């Protein structure tokens, strides 16, 4: 149940686990920003 | 369709349409287990398997408890192969009987004068030569030997005191070997735990759980994963590798509508058709499956003994 927020663990398939990370939705930064990428493994 | 049309099984026991393919090379044994669908528990099974996605993942899934332990093995029944089908050549049980078996053979045991196999027991005991002659004829004529086996309905905790007789054919063994095994198991209590450990995929069968205005239909759970034998008499029924501590398979304070099985259960990881205390028909697979997943055993790490009725999390 990807509900703990922040697809599979980390993967979003265009979810953090289970967890749903954040969703860009209509255009909101939350999902789109993804902590501004970079950082861990998105560098 | 396959299961269609829907029809509830009139017989409480899940009469098996087929049985595992007997072979005289294999030792004379059985291929059935008289379960009773006690209950269920989240027996967390650590699936230690490299390559698998759920590697060492504790599978907290329903271990469908089915009371199955020492079942009265009365005798054997001959079965000769005929051009018109399989015909029962003879049916020679043991001299010793049981009240539960007699209650099963009748409908008003207490009202009845307990005449069930009255002279038959005397004939079996006194005229042992006639029993031996019939047994010799069975060994020389019958193609298959259906080892008669009742249940422990009166022995184990249950309102029904009618022993569920089952014509469990001797799975494997020669004619002499099957007769010798039947003679050894004459008037004995065939234990389902002794027959199988219920630690892998099984071929459990039996009627479903009667819902109401359906269910109770004879089914056969193919590749029914069995977690472990839920020995209700032993305090360690739900005790596992990580849980341990003599955990009881029944929920804390008794399972819902089934309490604590007086004897061993057949707790199976997954589903099992049948309600609480509804007699199951666990059996061996007719065919053979050498799949790696079936061969690889999931290590039962933890289990669930929570007082589900109520505080569904209070294990103690």
């Amino acid at each position: 149940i990807m509900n703990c927020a922040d697809a599979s663990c980390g993967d979003m398939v265009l979810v953090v686990r289970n967890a749903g990370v954040i969703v860009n939705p209509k255009g909101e930064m939350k999902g789109s920003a993804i902590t501004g990428p970079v950082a861990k493994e998105c560098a | 369709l396959g299961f269609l049309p829907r029809k509830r099984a009139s017989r409480q026991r899940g009469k098996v349409k087929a049985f595992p393919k007997d072979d005289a090379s294999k030792p004379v044994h059985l291929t059935a287990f008289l379960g009773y669908k006690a209950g269920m528990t989240h027996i967390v099974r650590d699936l230690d398997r490299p390559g698998s996605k759920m590697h060492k993942r504790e599978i907290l899934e329903a271990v469908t408890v089915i009371e199955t332990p020492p079942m009265v093995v009365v005798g054997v029944v001959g079965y000769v192969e005929t051009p018109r089908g399989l015909r029962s050549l003879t049916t020679v049980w043991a001299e010793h009987l049981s009240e539960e078996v007699k209650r099963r053979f009748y409908k008003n045991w207490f009202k009845s004068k307990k005449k069930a196999f009255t002279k038959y027991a005397k004939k079996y005991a006194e005229s042992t030569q006639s029993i031996n002659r019939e047994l010799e004829r069975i060994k020389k004529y019958c193609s298959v030997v259906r080892v008669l086996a009742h249940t422990q309905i009166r022995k184990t905790p249950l309102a029904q005191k009618k022993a569920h007789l089952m014509e469990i054919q001797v799975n494997g063994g020669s004619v002499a070997d099957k007769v010798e095994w039947a003679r050894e198991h004459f008037e004995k209590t065939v234990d389902i735990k002794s027959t199988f450990e219920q630690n892998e995929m099984i071929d459990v069968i039996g009627v479903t759980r009667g819902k109401g205005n359906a269910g109770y239909m004879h089914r056969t759970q193919l590749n029914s994963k069995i977690y472990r034998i839920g020995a209700g008499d032993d305090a360690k029924n739900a005790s596992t590798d990580f849980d341990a501590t003599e955990k009881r398979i029944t929920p804390m304070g008794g399972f819902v509508r089934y309490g604590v099985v007086e004897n061993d259960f057949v707790m199976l990881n997954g589903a099992t058709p049948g309600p609480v205390k509804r007699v199951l028909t666990l059996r061996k697979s007719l065919l053979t499956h050498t799949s790696r997943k079936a061969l690889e055993p999931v290590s039962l790490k933890w289990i669930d003994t929570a007082s589900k009725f109520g505080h569904g999390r209070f294990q103690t």
């Binding site: 663990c9 970079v38 950082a39 861990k40 493994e41 998105c42 560098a43 | 590697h55 060492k56």
Partner: protein
């Protein structure tokens, strides 16, 4: 070395090459073959988070393995890890130490947002100063920096003297 590994290169992320360790199946075996013999390639799984250069950084001695590793996984890693291989449980902000801390004996530079406790954990236990720094803007240094004693870090397992890269690691 651009070690061929499935589809994603991610050799460093999967295997956080430490100073005297490599924190590592063919690619892990390849890391165990070359790097593992000298720098022990401990096959880190971290309870399914097999990526070491994403969670488990640190120079060999007290390598800052993520505390997110399960109790069995952490104990198995710690028991297998010797004194010069010890897997220090990174429980601070660098819980993604492998990506966060830029594992390297000289300096195990931690993520810019990594806590000082995680910074000191690699600094003291791993004998490799985890300076909290964002490698080329990316907060988690170990992912961006293929740190060595002498996302590049995610895509290249940089041991004390080695820099083994991934399948299709950008040249």
């Amino acid at each position: 070395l651009r070690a061929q590994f499935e589809n994603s290169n991610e050799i460093g992320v999967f295997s956080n090459l430490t100073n005297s360790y490599a924190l590592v199946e063919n690619f892990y075996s390849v890391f165990e073959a070359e790097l593992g013999d000298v720098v022990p390639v401990v096959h880190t799984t971290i309870g399914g988070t097999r990526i070491i250069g994403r969670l488990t950084c640190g120079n060999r001695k007290g390598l800052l393995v993520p505390s997110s590793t399960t109790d069995n996984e952490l104990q198995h890693l710690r028991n297998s890890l010797p004194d010069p291989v010890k897997i220090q449980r990174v429980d601070e902000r660098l819980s993604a130490l492998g990506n966060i801390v830029a594992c390297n004996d000289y300096v195990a530079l931690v993520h810019p947002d990594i806590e000082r406790e995680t910074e000191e954990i690699i600094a003291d236990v791993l004998d490799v100063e985890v300076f909290r720094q964002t490698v080329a803007g990316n907060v988690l240094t170990g992912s961006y920096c293929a740190l060595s004693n002498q996302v590049i870090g995610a895509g290249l397992v940089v041991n004390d003297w080695c820099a083994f890269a991934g399948l299709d690691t950008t040249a």
